[model samples]
Target: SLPNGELVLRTLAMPADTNANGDIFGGWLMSQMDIGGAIQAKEIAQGRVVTVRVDGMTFLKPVAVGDVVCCYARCIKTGHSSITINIEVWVKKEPIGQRYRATEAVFTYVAVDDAGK
Candidate 1:
């Protein structure tokens, strides 16, 4: 479940997102989480946003292809020109049975001016 003021972006793990072990790559998952966080950040910033840092990312479980990956993001804090977002990744296996948290991380993003500085 997501906390109040959180936003969720759901997607499926595709074959292309997997590694040689048949598990989804951490980098790929992180990218998805970043994108999820960016969406929320942009909405809050009401304009363009740039990712500054990703803090404390942990891979709790491996996601397999065809798994339904859900990323939940929320604004944890806001600075003068930046916002901190917390993202949680959950997965439900195809054919049902169980759902698990795949990963969680805190990503920092900054609102940028039109010049993108």
Candidate 2:
């Protein structure tokens, strides 16, 4: 079980993160989500792990540079050798502005022993 509300990771979006569309690249956001999920999975697994899959992802709104990106992750399920994490990304404009949800995704990670197997 996970708490109702808890922040996983939060950081500012830099100008270099923008894509040709003048918005944050979806790939970048996906990578951030992956990192966020990995963090949660590592805590649950209590060791090394690897990304096994990403179920589905949807970009709800555009994220721009200078925005504050917040990711919230929770463990959805766990197995003997794997774990599933759900991550949500929210973007808040810098300098005190309105906030917008940027994206959301689900990532699965598998625990790896010392052999790196």
Candidate 3:
């Protein structure tokens, strides 16, 4: 399926990131998604930011080793001190090169100063 956000993170799924079942670990995928969201969140906040929450994390497909993982970010809402973004993770299956959505989540970030306020 076609991804519905601005591309933010892209990387290959390595063996070290796989689970016992040989599929890429969900936590690792979520970790990457957070970083991707933070990139856009920082831009909107115009400075530093701290993650506040993650909502509706849905896994539509499993990621395999060697898959080309891609994270896309889309801004959804913003407030005086926080921003919300929807991140979609897609994967291009190895060799096949067909892209499919692997996961989607909404992340909230709070703008903060140097002292973490």
Candidate 4:
């Protein structure tokens, strides 16, 4: 079953994002996950945030061009200036129960002030 999480970003895979083999590029998908995780991280931190690191990224399948890519995220940890988020990508497949996980990772961000703190 698809894991429960907050849907932070969603977009369709396009030809421009595909590799020579015609599958969506993993780098592009990771960008989406990073952006999605930052969205939630900023909200939780109540201000601007910068990505510090990404951990434990695991891919289960190749994302196809034209598939709807959705990123789900959840906050897993928090510190004085750091916020950690767990993100997952899910592509909708035919039939109600066919959806599956594409990739996932833990993103760490640091809340910063105008002082860039």
Cα lDDT of model 3 by residue, 18-117, tens digit:
8888889999999999998889988887778899888999999998888899999999985776688999999996469788888978888888878766
Order the candidates by TM-score, highest first.
Answer: 3, 4, 1, 2
Please provide TM-scores, in order, for all candidate models, with all chains considered together.
Answer: 0.88, 0.87, 0.92, 0.90
**Candidate 1 structure quality by residue, lDDT tens digits, 43-107:** 88888889988889999998888878888787888577768988888887646846787887888
Q: What TM value does model 1 have?
A: 0.88
Among all windows of 10 consecutive residues in model 3, the one with the lowest summed lDDT is: 75-84
lDDT of 2 at 11: 92
Among these predicted structures, which one has the highest TM-score?
A: 3
- Whole-model lDDT per candidate: 0.82, 0.79, 0.88, 0.84
Measured by lDDT, the strongest candidate is 3
Per-residue lDDT for 99 in model 3?
89
Off by more than 4 A, model 4 = 94-97
Model 3, position 110: C-alpha lDDT score: 86
Candidate 4 per-residue C-alpha lDDT over 71-102 given as tens digits, one digit per residue, 9 for 90 to 100? 89988875777788999999865454357888
Q: What is the lDDT of residue 1 in candidate 1?
A: 48
For model 1, the superposed segments whose C-alpha errors exceed 4 Å read 1-7, 94-97
Looking at model 1, which ten-residue stretch has the lowest summed lDDT? 1-10
RMSD of each: 2.0, 3.1, 1.5, 1.8
lDDT of 2: 0.79
User: What's the residue-level lDDT of 63 in candidate 3?
Assistant: 88
Model 2 quality (TM-score): 0.87
